[PDB]
Design a protein around this ligand. Structure first.
Ligand SMILES: Oc1cc(O)cc(/C=C/c2ccc(O)c(O)c2)c1
Ligand SMILES: Oc1cc(O)cc(/C=C/c2ccc(O)c(O)c2)c1
Ligand SMILES: Oc1cc(O)cc(/C=C/c2ccc(O)c(O)c2)c1
Ligand SMILES: Oc1cc(O)cc(/C=C/c2ccc(O)c(O)c2)c1
Ligand SMILES: Oc1cc(O)cc(/C=C/c2ccc(O)c(O)c2)c1
Ligand SMILES: Oc1cc(O)cc(/C=C/c2ccc(O)c(O)c2)c1
Ligand SMILES: [Co+2]
Ligand SMILES: [Co+2]
Lengths: 497, 497
């Protein structure tokens, strides 16, 4: 077999990116300042964190075993619980005490035959009394919200119609539906998209099979009152390339950024329209909604080149690390239009941004508040001389958060400091009567001075000020998505506005 | 109540002394080099690690909640399990989410009435299928060796005759007895010493009540074939001082270092003889044995002033941090002698030393190998400019290990490096046929460059060379005692030579 290394090597596991691989508890976390005593609930987040050194050199960040953090808040106190998802990969590798799964989404490089290749490392959501640990090549893994025990692969009581479940389902605050899809829904290289939804009682509602023009990466999607929308990243899969040991994904400069629009209820596969946005990278969706004219306003991060630069085109063409900016774009779509090409989007702010969150009490409807990560290259904002030698590689960088008020155009910016970077934030309603976007924001910080993690708590009334700073004595490696589950929400999701 | 701080403050919890307070698992630790594949068993160690910030300012290191580490070795692989002892203190403070126990060994400063005040933080030994977490003011807490679950206060099936159980019981490799004592055995300030022992079947054997000339700290003791020996540190307890909120311990410059000798079997309390060594600090016992003439050779660390300088004399007089050195002393005692004053000891090496270990297969008999911590002030051995600002305070420093061959007088020194310090080592027999002192030594390192801990594995054939260096991505705070439990030993203790 390829040799199993006994310590981590390479930039993707150096410095702050070095795996810690701890599971367990740290109660009564140290707090500077004061956590508002009315906050009650749990911040769950997932990070890729390789449990064993890979036999693949420079294995991408996205291929790391999912490790779940829960920060449990009550009466101004907070406890951390941490546990790896017990995926097939995790368990078999733990038994063997070495890596067995090979290249990202390339089963032909695996040392044993896996049934499920999930690292369950991308998102962690709450649904009907369970956590679901998500990875877009796989079904969810169900977990206990209190103990973080893994129950196993979750197939929604045998109803799951797809081999794949997106990392970005949307929760309709009015209907209480979980709206879902999977791409490559019939396996590697398939152009099949399965769109499906579940009512609050757990029963499957929609199931529509449609066909993508290319086998392209559909990382995120959007949902409005009457439509679902599928933006395709111009990374394309060829299984023949994979069989020869090549990458699952390869950029294609010759295609548009497709944006599929399908009626949300009662559609057939052939009802999809594949609009063609200017070539670019489909970043995360803030939210979409239908305006007065019935046109879809799709607000999302959007770049003009390949953000995943480690997967270049067939001739190795692509950007360098740190080159590509994504901007907060607004695309207008009209399902009734027979014109497929779309105009360049308008931009809501100038910042290089990503990881947008809204008040999910208005998800799928008109929103007027967005919170997002920013990367400001202005001299001094980040002390690169100090940070970069300690940072390692393979993950995106954020040196602040921003809050945009869409009505007034006002922006507040939170800068944690010159030697700190941020993850994706969460928004917490102040209480059940709070106006849209009014409450608290939390975000995990990487502190490169201490080489420790911190959890910052902000009040939306003044995003520049930390109300509390929770000081972890360990590192939580840079992660992907996370969610707030408020104690006052019986089904884990906030009530509609 | 006195205010409960929400983060740690003061030198005793700064830098590398900052509590981490993690409990859980880190499997498949990173290894540089190669752990010998034939090593099979577990290294257990205990550290004081406050679970909650103290309401006592500059609370001594010795008053921190006991946290148990287990390093489980097999086939060249190693896993860490870590868990706090569930003492009465730990549980009640966890329930309250604040500190309740007050000053070290002073119940009159507690905010609630405790039955047991143990932090179980000083030693962790194996006995008849359980771990015993030891603290000299208390009975042991029994724990599961595999899971580190706490069973509870242990009273040896109702046989324990004493309120107190030493942190330093001895295991007779021939008789398989556990030889024990407790001082202040009838409560705070009492001069009662209870000497007691247990046969390998768990039945109590000896129980002798004797009387100390002063109520002094007896941290360690020695056992030979026919005698038990009690060296008294000139720290003295006055309960009236404690009732007014004062320290349990106060140095007394006017008294000798008493060394009590009692017949090991069948004695009465009045058979003890209180020999009087020159004034000084009774450090840890390497081992004691009877020579050809039946004279006791007692080998122990010995200082000429108060190592515990934070507990000075009645007028506040004593040494500064880092001033007092301890030396490896040999005291000769003759039980038949009626002359109480003893001569100054001879010294086996010149190093400032402590924490001596022998091959416990010859415990209570003649030994010819000792392994010990050293602190070498020779320029360059420790980079103090770098280390001291990161070190915090309250714990002793060791910048190497030494191996003395007592026959040849040869010494080997292991220096982990200029920016690393060590804990107490353990010795592992190479195999069941190994000669005395032949095998492996392990020791936990504090790495001040990385602010991480490491576990070094050494071969006794060349102590200067690390065969393996196990790299932890967290800190294990400086700790107290630890023990090896070999998988090949049915009762957890090695067979006699
Ligand atoms: O030694 C083996 C061989 C094998 O062929 C399969 C397994 C385990 C499978 C598995 C374990 C845990 C999971 O959560 C899961 O989805 C699958 C273990
Ligand atoms: O910084 C960004 C921006 C973005 O728009 C998307 C991602 C992540 C996508 C992803 C895709 C596939 C995976 O398997 C996975 O773990 C993550 C990261
Ligand atoms: O060797 C390096 C150094 C570095 O500073 C950054 C990267 C990668 C950047 C990146 C990784 C993942 C993403 O999802 C993304 O948007 C950006 C790689
Ligand atoms: O008056 C009280 C109130 C309380 O809330 C708890 C206790 C004791 C708890 C305890 C728990 C575990 C132990 O091992 C132990 O010795 C004691 C006593
Ligand atoms: O550096 C040294 C040298 C020594 O000879 C003894 C000790 C520790 C003794 C101790 C005494 C009472 C306690 O309660 C405790 O946790 C520890 C530390
Ligand atoms: O507040 C402080 C500051 C400091 O710089 C050092 C100490 C303690 C040192 C120490 C020295 C020798 C020992 O055996 C021991 O247990 C502790 C305490
Ligand atoms: Co995403
Ligand atoms: Co000791």
């Amino acid at each position: 077999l390829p040799p199993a290394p006994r310590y981590f090597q390479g930039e993707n596991t150096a410095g702050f990116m070095r795996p810690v691989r701890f599971e367990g508890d740290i109660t009564n976390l140290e707090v500077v300042g004061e956590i508002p005593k009315s906050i009650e609930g749990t911040f769950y987040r997932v990070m890729p964190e390789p449990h064993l050194p890979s036999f693949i050199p420079n294995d991408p960040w996205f291929n790391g075993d999912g490790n779940i953090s829960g920060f449990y808040f009550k009466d101004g106190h907070v406890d951390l619980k941490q546990r790896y998802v017990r995926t097939e990969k995790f368990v078999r590798e733990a038994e063997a005490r070495r890596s067995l799964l090979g290249k990202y989404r390339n089963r032909y490089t695996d040392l044993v035959e896996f049934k499920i290749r999930s690292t369950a490392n991308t998102n962690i959501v709450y649904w009907r009394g369970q956590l679901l640990a998500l990875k877009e090549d796989s079904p969810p893994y169900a977990m206990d919200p209190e103990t973080l025990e893994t129950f196993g692969v979750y197939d929604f009581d045998g109803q799951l119609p797809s081999l794949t479940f997106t990392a970005h389902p949307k929760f309709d605050p009015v209907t209480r539906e979980m709206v879902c899809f999977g791409y490559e829904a019939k396996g590697d290289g398939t152009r099949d998209i399965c769109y499906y939804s579940f009512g609050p009682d757990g029963k499957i509602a929609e199931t529509v099979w449609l066909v993508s023009p290319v086998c392209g990466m559909i990382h995120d999607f959007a949902v409005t009152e009457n439509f679902v929308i599928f933006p395709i990243i111009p990374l394309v899969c060829d299984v023949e390339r994979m069989k020869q040991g090549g990458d699952h994904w390869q950029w294609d400069y010759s295609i548009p950024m497709y944006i599929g629009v399908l009626p949300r209820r009662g559609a057939q596969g052939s009802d999809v329209k594949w609009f063609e946005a200017p070539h670019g990278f489909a970043g995360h969706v803030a939210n979409a909604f239908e305006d007065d004219k019935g046109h879809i306003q799709l607000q999302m991060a959007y770049a003009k080149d390949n953000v995943f630069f480690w997967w270049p085109d067939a001739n190795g063409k692509g950007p360098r690390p740190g080159e590509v900016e994504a901007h907060f774009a607004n695309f207008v779509l009209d399902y009734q239009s027979d014109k497929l090409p779309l105009a360049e989007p308008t931009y809501l702010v100038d910042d290089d941004m990503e990881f947008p969150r809204i008040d999910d009490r208005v998800a799928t409807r008109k929103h007027k508040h967005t919170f997002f990560c920013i990367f400001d290259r202005k001299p001094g904002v980040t002390d690169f001389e100090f940070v970069m030698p300690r940072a390692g590689g393979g993950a995106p960088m954020s040196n602040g958060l921003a809050h945009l008020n869409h009505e007034t155009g006002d922006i507040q910016r939170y800068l944690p400091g010159p030697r700190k970077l941020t993850g994706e934030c969460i928004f917490i309603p102040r209480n059940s009567e709070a106006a849209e976007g009014d409450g608290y924001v939390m975000v995990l910080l990487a502190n490169y001075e201490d080489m420790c993690s911190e959890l910052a708590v902000l009040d939306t009334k003044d995003l520049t000020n930390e109300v509390a700073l929770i000081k972890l004595p360990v590192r939580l490696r840079p992660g992907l998505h996370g969610n707030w589950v408020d104690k006052s929400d019986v089904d884990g999701h906030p009530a509609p506005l």
